[PDB]
Amino acid sequence: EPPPEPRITLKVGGQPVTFLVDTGAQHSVLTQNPGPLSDKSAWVQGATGGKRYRWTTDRKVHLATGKVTHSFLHVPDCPYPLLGRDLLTKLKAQIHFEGSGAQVVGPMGQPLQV
Amino acid sequence: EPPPEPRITLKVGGQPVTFLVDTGAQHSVLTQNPGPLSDKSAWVQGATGGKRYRWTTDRKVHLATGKVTHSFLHVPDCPYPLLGRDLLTKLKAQIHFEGSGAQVVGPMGQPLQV
Numbered sequence: 001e002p003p004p005e006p007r008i009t010l011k012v013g014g015q016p017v018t019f020l021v022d023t024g025a026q027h028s029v030l031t032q033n034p035g036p037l038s039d040k041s042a043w044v045q046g047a048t049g050g051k052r053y054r055w056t057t058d059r060k061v062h063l064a065t066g067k068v069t070h071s072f073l074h075v076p077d078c079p080y081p082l083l084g085r086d087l088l089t090k091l092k093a094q095i096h097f098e099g100s101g102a103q104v105v106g107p108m109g110q111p112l113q114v
Numbered sequence: 115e116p117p118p119e120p121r122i123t124l125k126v127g128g129q130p131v132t133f134l135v136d137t138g139a140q141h142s143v144l145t146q147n148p149g150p151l152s153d154k155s156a157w158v159q160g161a162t163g164g165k166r167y168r169w170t171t172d173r174k175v176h177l178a179t180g181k182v183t184h185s186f187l188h189v190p191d192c193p194y195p196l197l198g199r200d201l202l203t204k205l206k207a208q209i210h211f212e213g214s215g216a217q218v219v220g221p222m223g224q225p226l227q228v
């Protein structure tokens with residue numbers, strides 16, 4: 001069962017993750033069997049309350065133009081992974097609701113060759 | 115208090131409301147001075163938990179694509195209003211990540227701000 005649109009699949013640590021593309025997330029989120037965790041945590045404020053969640057250690061993430069090293073919040077209270085403004089800035093993504101559904105493309109309108 | 119980019123100010127119930135444009139919000143949210151409330155409520159799942167919130171009564175929302183009626187979730191636990199997929203679908207918005215921020219444009223590529 002995929003997250004709602006807009007969504008995108010990126011390779012994280014070598015394997016695909018399908019994210020909800022989330023302009024309301026300050027940083028990107030994993031939710032399940034996230035791999036090695038840092039000892040560090042962040043305070044996460046959600047719509048209904050806040051508490052702390054652990055940072056992953058660094059992950060290799062395949063974007064359209066290159067790999068990047070990036071860390072994620074591990075938030076098992078979230079229903080699916082969230083690709084937030086941290087990674088939307090690196091992708092220079094555009095999100096379009098004026099077509100069929102909501103679609104996510106690259107900086108020149110290109111389906112992200114990711 | 116003021117939301118990060120991408121953000122947009124809309125007239126809602128005759129007053130300006132500055133929203134975080136939130137592709138991760140299934141429904142749009144008002145946080146302070148929501149106007150009259152209905153006794154209808156909904157369960158909201160946030161990133162860190164869930165809680166029941168009330169719906170506002172109907173508001174006129176002045177979208178660039180034309181004014182419509184919409185009702186909002188009143189979520190006073192949220193730090194700023196959220197413009198979610200329910201209204202982004204009506205606005206047929208595009209959201210463009212460029213530089214360190216993000217801008218909102220209309221269905222025919224007209225900027226809706228700046």
Ligand SMILES: CC(C)[C@H](NC(=O)[C@H](C)NC(=O)OCc1ccccc1)C(=O)N[C@@H](Cc1ccccc1)[C@@H](O)[C@H](O)[C@H](Cc1ccccc1)NC(=O)[C@@H](NC(=O)[C@H](C)NC(=O)OCc1ccccc1)C(C)C
Binds near residue numbers: 160
């Ligand atoms: C994911 C978080 C990191 C994010 N929080 C933050 O960004 C805050 C301000 N930042 C912060 O915590 O900083 C972290 C940090 C620290 C150090 C370094 C870097 C980062 C967030 O909760 N963002 C949310 C918006 C928001 C923004 C600011 C403050 C509070 C909320 C949504 O975009 C985000 O997409 C969530 C993710 C999500 C998706 C699905 C489930 C649970 C959570 N959606 C939502 O919370 C919305 N829920 C939903 O869309 C759910 C799926 N549907 C729902 O409840 O249905 C309502 C319904 C009503 C009636 C009929 C049918 C349905 C909510 C606003 C309505």
Ligand code: NA
Binds near residue numbers: 098099203
């Ligand atoms: Na659409």
